[PDB]
């Protein structure tokens with residue numbers, strides 16, 4: 380009584396954050412496994428070629444959920460469910476470089492795509508029509524890698540499904556859609572063929588029902604797509620809010636500070652980066668209140684009302700100090716505080732991968748200046764594929780810690796002594 384779903388380890392799909400497992404596919408697979416009264420077991424594939432290999436052996440996974448494009452036709456050997464999400468392939472280029480207008484303008488550019496993907500096949504055929512088109516494909520990269528590579532200019536163009544872009548665009552300021560390339564199409568789950576429609580029919584029953592019940596559109600808004608974390612405000616705006624907001628809460632930050640033997644101004648910085656000192660702030664991610672705590676985490680810290688500024692401040696402060704208390708003793712202050720900010724955001728599991736990765740690189744797993752260099756690698760498959768817990772958006776962790784420290788510095792400077 381265990382549903383095995385194979386997927387890809389990636390932000391649009393499945394990954395681990397500080398609260399455990401998450402992702403569009405993962406949630407859809409879980410709400411489905413529950414509709415079957417079985418346990419969901421995730422298995423992840425290394426690349427797309429391997430996913431389909433795995434799906435087609437006997438004794439393999441039930442189905443594949445991985446934002447797969449059917450394309451197909453009638454290879455009965457692999458069969459597709461109804462679609463649960465409609466997308467469009469898009470050519471992506473780097474801002475301030477020659478924006479291609481037409482398929483012919485893909486000639487002369489360096490292009491990279493997932494090896495074994497629909498899009499590699501979309502380009503393969505375009506190469507008959509223009510034998511000068513050249514492109515590379517790789518198994519050691521995921522779409523998140525491709526966008527970074529354009530953003531940073533290591534490649535000119537790539538070709539990806541629009542949803543992957545909607546989720547990530549914001550983490551890549553320099554990238555821009557050049558044009559749609561192909562008709563809109565639907566994504567779907569993949570099952571092996573196929574003589575018993577036992578398994579297929581309910582999936583199709585599930586997806587059809589979950590479309591009219593709002594579940595698909597709910598998820599789509601949950602994930603696709605938005606900037607949780609980021610945003611250093613003006614020094615202007617912070618000075619503003621020092622006068623308009625902090626006076627309400629300074630009292631609570633101070634006492635929690637005292638209660639827990641920790642600098643109140645860092646607690647106050649966490650909260651500013653968190654919600655901008657807004658006790659009613661909330662996210663579609665399911666965090667809420669001044670210290671943007673999750674429900675499980677709030678209950679765990681004794682917070683019975685997430686919207687009460689005093690409670691959320693006390694519970695968030697409690698959460699931060701414990702995380703800082705649980706790090707390896709080998710990490711000393713002040714780095715220790717920075718690791719905890721790093722862990723507060725990305726989860727200790729991932730932070731741990733970073734330190735191992737840091738060690739193996741001959742760096743100091745105890746120096747925030749070093750591990751901080753490793754955290755961004757967790758969003759690079761060549762690297763995160765080699766870690767225990769896999770993908771993490773480590774660049775956003777770094778911004779988190781940085782930003783929080785920055786507010787902490789201004790606060791110190793103004794307080795006072």
Ligand SMILES: N[C@@H](CCC(=O)O)C(=O)O
Pocket residue numbers: 427445446447491492493496497498499522525537538539540543
């Ligand atoms: N097939 C990949 C995209 C491949 C590419 O970017 O070229 C996906 O599942 O989104």
